[PDB]
Design a protein around this ligand. Structure first.
Ligand SMILES: CC[C@H](NC(=O)C[C@H](O)[C@H](CC(C)C)NC(=O)[C@@H](NC(=O)[C@H](Cc1cccc2ccccc12)NC(C)=O)C(C)C)C(=O)N[C@@H](Cc1cccc2ccccc12)C(N)=O
Lengths: 99, 99
C-alpha cells in the first residue's frame, strides 16, 4: 500500500508469536522495539536519537511480518518510547518514499 | 522523485537564504533543524526522541524549499545531530510512503 502522512505511519507487526504496532521510520537506520520476550543470543549496542543515546540488545536473523509481509533481519530491543521499523527492514519489504 | 531506502533519504533544502541537507523522516511528527540564525521571534517547545527529550525554539510560518518544492510551516531549531524534515512538512510536499 501507499501511505499518506497526515497521521503517523503505524502498521501491525508479528514477531516472536506476538502482535505489536510499529511506526514505519525512514529516519531510523535500524529497527528498535520496546522491551519484549525474545529468544536467543543477543549483544549490546547503543544507538543515538534526539534526546540522547540508548542501550540496546541486538538480535540477528529475526523474522518479522510487517503488514503481513515477511522479512528476516536484525532487531534491537530496548527502552524506546515507540516500536520503530527502520531502514534495514523497510528496504526488505520494498518500501519507497515518493513526492 | 522515488527515493528507495538503501541509503539515508537526504535532500537539499533552502531556508533563510542558506542551503542545508536534511533527512526525510516519516518517524518525526515535527521538523527540527540544527542551530542556525533564523529571522524572528519564537515560542518554546520540547520534543521527545529516542534518547529522552530536548528543548527547542519553535518558529511559525517559516518558508522552506525542499528539493525545489516550497512549503510554509512550523520549524524547530536546536540540539539535533541531523536536520530532519518531519511529517508537518512532508504532507505539504505531497510525500507518501509505498510498499
Ligand atoms: C525528532 C522528533 C521525534 N522523532 C524521532 O526522534 C525519530 C526519528 O526518526 C529519529 C531521527 C534521528 C536522526 C535523530 N531516528 C532515530 O532516532 C534513529 N536513530 C538513528 O537512526 C541513528 C541516527 C544517528 C546517526 C549518526 C549519529 C547520531 C548521533 C546521535 C543520534 C543519532 C545519530 N543511528 C544510530 C546508529 O543511532 C533510531 C530510531 C535508531 C518525534 O517525532 N517526536 C515526537 C513523538 C515521539 C515522542 C517520544 C519518543 C519518540 C520516539 C521516536 C519517535 C517519536 C517519538 C514528539 N512530539 O516529541
Amino acid at each position: 500500500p501507499q501511505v499518506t502522512l497526515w497521521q503517523r505511519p503505524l502498521v501491525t507487526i508479528k514477531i516472536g508469536g506476538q502482535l505489536k504496532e510499529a511506526l514505519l521510520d525512514t529516519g531510523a537506520d535500524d529497527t528498535v522495539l520496546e522491551e519484549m520476550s525474545l529468544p536467543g543470543a543477543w549483544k549490546p549496542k547503543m544507538i543515538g536519537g534526539i534526546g540522547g543515546f540508548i542501550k540496546v540488545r541486538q538480535y540477528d536473523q529475526i523474522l518479522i511480518e510487517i503488514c503481513g509481509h515477511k522479512a528476516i533481519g536484525t532487531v534491537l530491543v530496548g527502552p524506546t518510547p515507540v516500536n520503530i521499523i527502520g531502514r534495514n527492514l523497510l528496504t526488505q519489504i520494498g518500501c519507497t518514499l515518493n513526492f
